[PDB]
Amino acid sequence: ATGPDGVKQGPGVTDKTIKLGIATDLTGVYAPLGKSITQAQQLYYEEVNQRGGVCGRTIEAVVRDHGYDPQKAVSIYTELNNNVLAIPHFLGSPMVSAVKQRIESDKMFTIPSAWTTALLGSKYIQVTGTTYDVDMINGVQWLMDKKLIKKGDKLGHVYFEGDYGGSALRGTKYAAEQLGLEVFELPIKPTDRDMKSQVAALAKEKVDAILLSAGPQQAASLAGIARSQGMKQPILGSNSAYSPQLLATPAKPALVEGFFIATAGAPMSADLPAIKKLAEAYSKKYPKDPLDSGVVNGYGGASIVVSALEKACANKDLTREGLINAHRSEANADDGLGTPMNFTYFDKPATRKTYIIKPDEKATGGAVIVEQAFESELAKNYQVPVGTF
């Protein structure tokens, strides 16, 4: 329990090692993005280890694949929880929801790649960036500002049922109420591979804009089918409704025009020194794995946990209490990757600024900024739910 350097050691911490857990999707709908996130975290931890680790201890990240399935995530959580100090990458809103009570009981610092409001309200869970609702509020306001929609128009929102799509949808509906828009709602599951019935329904409803809270496979299908039907409505996706791999498929033309993504994260093409450095470092380590916005997300999550570990080390306290208090002492985080945040609270989003990006085969990371990160008044005044959607 206390190392020979006088540092208190919690679960997963020995005299020479700090074990961290990663619960991701390597095989399901988010496979290429979970790979990128996971590899970017490993890149960060390797760089740290090369510089002597933390508190003289090497960081070891153990990786489990839940396949974007909540029951498997639970099983994985119970296999890791007594033997890792923290979980700096846990992919997926329903997956982390399923273990929220255990996280709280265990005092497990968890950094999801998941942005539901259902994960707010826990000291131990850092929801990074914006929440999904705030991204759709910003995004709908942007559609109106850009005259892609007007008062009285109808939005069709295709969404993964539950925490992720439902949170996004909450934002859509708030914006629609405030702005005088109608909403047509289309729930889907991650196992729905083919969007042609959804496209048919969107067309029947004569929507003016199409919103999507799903993964890359659904985005390719929906965009491709819509454009093959002559639909000209803009498409606005949540932050994970795209991977650059899709540009190497016939969906490309339906993604590089008329398709936008609302996200708190900067793409790999942003003109920031830390982004350029990351692009070079990641490309060097993993030459065969395309750069994507998951790389940014994973490197950033690793940066968050390491910052907290270093502060906890300096307090001679690599326990779960020491770690969370180190993390929650940071009111002004800015890792240089394009998403400044405040970590001292957890009853509201860490930021309310959303970028609009689009797919671009010419750009580093397969995407470019269309609108620099902004917080609409609409989003600023919105009441964000805490621990539910």
**Stretch in the footprint of ligand PLM (CB under 6 A) among 87-95, 278-286, 305-313, 374-382:** 87-95
Out of 265, 349, 365, 366, which residue is the one contacting ligand PLM (CB under 6 A)? 265
DSSP letters along 93-145, please? HHHHHHTHHHHHHHT--EEEE---GGGTT-TTB---S--HHHHHHHHHHHHHH
Give min distance, CB of 288 to ligand PLM, in A: 19
The owner of tokens 């826990």 is: 122
How many whole angstroms separate alpha carbon 245 and alpha carbon 366?
8
Whether 302 and 44 have beta carbons less than 8 Å apart is answered as yes
Out of 41, 81, 93, 364, which residue is the one contacting ligand PLM (CB under 6 A)? 93
Binding mask 25-44 for ligand PLM (x = CB under 6 A): -----x--x-----------
Whether 131 and 384 have beta carbons less than 8 Å apart is answered as yes
In order of 40, 50, 128, 148, 239, the CA distances from 120 in angstroms are 25, 35, 10, 32, 18
Give min distance, CB of 28 to ligand PLM, in A: 10
Closer Cβ to ligand PLM, 11 or 340, answer by number: 340
Out of 41, 126, 221, 239, which residue is the one contacting ligand PLM (CB under 6 A)? 239
Give min distance, CB of 384 to ligand PLM, in A: 16
Q: Which of 257, 291, 289 is nearest to 370 (CA)?
A: 257
Q: Could you say which residues in the range 326-345 bind ligand PLM, by CB under 6 A?
A: 339
The amino acid at residue 311 is: K
Closer Cβ to ligand PLM, 10 or 244, answer by number: 244
Give min distance, CB of 15 to ligand PLM, in A: 35
Rounded (5°) CA angle 274-320-10: 110
| Contacting residues toward ligand PLM, per CB under 6 A | 30, 33, 91-93, 113-116, 128-129, 164, 239-240, 263-265, 293-294, 297, 339
